[PDB]
Design an enzyme around this catalytic site. Structure first.
Site, PDB file in Angstrom:
ATOM      1  N   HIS A   1      52.094  79.777  19.189  1.00  0.00           N
ATOM      2  CA  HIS A   1      52.562  78.396  19.180  1.00  0.00           C
ATOM      3  C   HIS A   1      51.531  77.414  18.597  1.00  0.00           C
ATOM      4  O   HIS A   1      51.637  76.189  18.692  1.00  0.00           O
ATOM      5  CB  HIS A   1      53.005  77.970  20.588  1.00  0.00           C
TER       6      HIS A   1
ATOM      7  N   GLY B   1      44.567  72.431  26.940  1.00  0.00           N
ATOM      8  CA  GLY B   1      43.724  73.053  25.942  1.00  0.00           C
ATOM      9  C   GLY B   1      43.158  74.404  26.318  1.00  0.00           C
ATOM     10  O   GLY B   1      42.242  74.884  25.634  1.00  0.00           O
TER      11      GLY B   1
ATOM     12  N   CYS C   1      45.110  77.285  26.583  1.00  0.00           N
ATOM     13  CA  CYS C   1      45.826  78.422  26.031  1.00  0.00           C
ATOM     14  C   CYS C   1      44.870  79.240  25.162  1.00  0.00           C
ATOM     15  O   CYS C   1      43.824  78.759  24.712  1.00  0.00           O
ATOM     16  CB  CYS C   1      47.044  77.989  25.206  1.00  0.00           C
TER      17      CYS C   1
END
Ligand code: 80I
Lengths: 300, 299
Positions: free
Chosen positions: A40, A145, A147
């Site tokens: 993503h 932040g 991920c």
């Protein structure tokens, strides 16, 4: 005498990078010539609600991805190849990571434990250990932040990478990818709301925990009564409990205490009813966050 | 609300095996100094009461051998041994190339720090403890973990605060600050030792209650208030530490609008029982999470 233990994070810190696509940025794992990060990253904030990753991929090119190494040995990092893999992006860079450790890719089964390295902007900030819930989520601590943070175990010198962070669900409950791309619990990496299945007690870890209780003198709950494994897995399916699967690490505990698996299966059946205001290693609820492996290495 | 340590790769780069005759344990290698618990000089037999002053002068140029096992392996030749408190300050002819910016600050009860447990100079696991009001820690150390190190990080500065030395009756541990002094002034000697009776880290319970409110568990707040001064007098009799507020506890007060003194009163009530209620999934009060913890993890 039982504390939440994680592997020493070093090996993995040597592998953390920042991955950027346009303005979106997250964390990656630089192993040899490959860089893994969640797919993503390509999707603009606007399309996050229903992305078309097959589109995004072909629409992208190596100049879309910038990788940067902010820690330790600084690095000139240039992408020369890209593929998507389930929910995972597989970028190819031109410099092999010299601090690439011995590694593999195994998907964790529920109940098992692993270490996770909480990273922001390709900069590690904290380590903590979790267990893979039976509803295929984890109760970590993860912020904006994070991920692309990673979850790993370690037998010997081999790091078994097992988890890449991806998303948050209701409060405090997180999930992500195995490195074969597949999202745990078949969750969709989209900004839609998603409902989790129900969380069950990992029965094997309860057993280990009770064993660790016996090892520290807390044995009041041990009665001669015994429920079989076959009978237990039946009562289990109707009380929010996982199938008990015995392992050799569990047999080891069973011998040094001389208290049988089936003695502690039957107690689990009584203690879920209520401790009736009693404590086992300081708690009123059954503990399932410790593995038999844990209890063996720690109370050895 | 998870137990969280710092990354350890920095500290891992400094670990080292120290060997003195039959004895062996871990040390920390910063600049040209290797730090380690001094009982390595004592032969295993004679620990019941050593004369570390005798043992130290008995040492010669090659009494200590020192190995680095991780990263670039190396034997290091030591060029001078000094003692200091319960620690051996060893001097080595090579400055550690991976030395970080560090300080040596003693930790006070209630505060959290990260531990890196090593055996034979090799990192094996990392966790986080809080220093108990009685100057022990509830940790997981086994044979050969002597010398493992506890640290906090303030920016990119490692703050070394602990070197592990011993285990009391059931698994409560202690060690020294890097000034040399044992926390609790337990003796680096093989005798049974009484640990004082523990207490409740009042501040960490106030933090934890603020962690509840943030997650929507406010049922225990009532307009009643106990003053800090009132609390501490009460605390003396009820197995609590005296309350010392902080810029960090103040942040919770603000983003919740809940006064410190409401949770001080709320503590006095809940000390008895939860009256059949649960707070973030628990029956007794929880004191191992700091105001900094709650600030970082619910931010
Ligand atoms: C003497 O009557 C006693 C009664 C009751 C309790 C007692 N406890 C100790 C003790 O703790 N003694 C220290 C050495 C003394 C000289 C200060 C020690 O042994 N420390 C370990 C760390 C320990 C090992 C287990 N978990 C750890 O943290 C070192 O790291 C080396 O390890 P090993 O000797 O090879 O086991 C003595 C004693």
């Amino acid at each position: 005498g039982l504390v939440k233990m994680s592997h020493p994070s070093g090996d993995v810190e040597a592998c953390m990078v920042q991955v950027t696509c346009g303005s979106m940025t997250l964390n990656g794992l630089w192993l040899d010539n490959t860089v893994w990060c969640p797919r993503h990253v390509m999707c603009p904030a606007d399309q996050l609600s229903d992305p078309n990753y097959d589109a995004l991929l072909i629409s992208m090119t190596n100049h879309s991805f910038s990788v940067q190494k902010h820690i330790g040995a600084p690095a000139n990092l240039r992408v020369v190849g890209h593929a998507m893999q389930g929910t995972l992006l597989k970028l190819t860079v031109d410099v092999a990571n010299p601090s690439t450790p011995a590694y593999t890719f195994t998907t964790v089964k529920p109940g098992a434990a692993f270490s996770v390295l909480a990273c922001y902007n390709g900069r590690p900030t904290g380590t903590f250990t979790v267990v893979m819930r039976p509803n295929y989520t984890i109760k970590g601590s993860f912020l904006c932040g994070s991920c692309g943070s990673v979850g790993y175990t370690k037998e010997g010198s081999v790091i078994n990478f097992c988890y890449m962070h991806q998303m948050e669900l209701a409060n405090g409950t997180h999930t992500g990818s195995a490195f074969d791309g597949t999202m745990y619990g078949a969750f969709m990496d989209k900004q839609v709301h998603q409902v989790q299945l129900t969380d069950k007690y990992c029965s094997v870890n309860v057993v280990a925990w009770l064993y660790a209780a016996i090892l520290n003198g807390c044995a009041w709950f041990v009665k001669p009564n015994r429920t079989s494994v076959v009978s237990f897995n039946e009562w289990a399916l109707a009380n929010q409990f996982t199938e008990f699967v015995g392992t050799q690490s569990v047999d080891m505990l069973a011998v040094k205490t001389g208290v049988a698996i089936e003695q502690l299966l039957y107690a689990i059946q009584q203690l879920y009813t209520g401790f009736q205001g009693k404590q086992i290693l300081g708690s009123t609820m059954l503990e399932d966050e410790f593995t038999p492996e844990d209890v063996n290495m720690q109370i050895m």
